[PDB]
């Protein structure tokens, strides 16, 4: 009725702070893993060159 309640009440602030920091860390890790992937596609000049060769030019 007296002791354990008081010590729990004393614990609350530090635990709240640490859990907030942990959530911020999770969000930071989520953001840090985001990279924009620039894809590379076959240049159409080679396609045009192959078209010309097929014409026997």
């Amino acid at each position: 009725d007296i002791m354990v309640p008081s010590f729990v009440y004393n614990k609350l602030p530090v635990i709240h702070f640490l859990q907030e920091k942990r959530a911020e860390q999770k969000l930071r890790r989520v953001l840090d893993e985001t990279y924009t992937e620039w894809t590379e596609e076959l240049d159409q000049a080679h396609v045009t060159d192959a078209i010309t060769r097929s014409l026997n030019i």
């Binding site: 076959l42 159409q44 080679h46 396609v47 192959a50 078209i51 097929s54």
Partner: peptide
């Protein structure tokens, strides 16, 4: 049409 087919094959 032939240009398209060649383009598809190369891609």
């Amino acid at each position: 049409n032939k240009n398209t087919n060649i383009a598809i094959q190369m891609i």
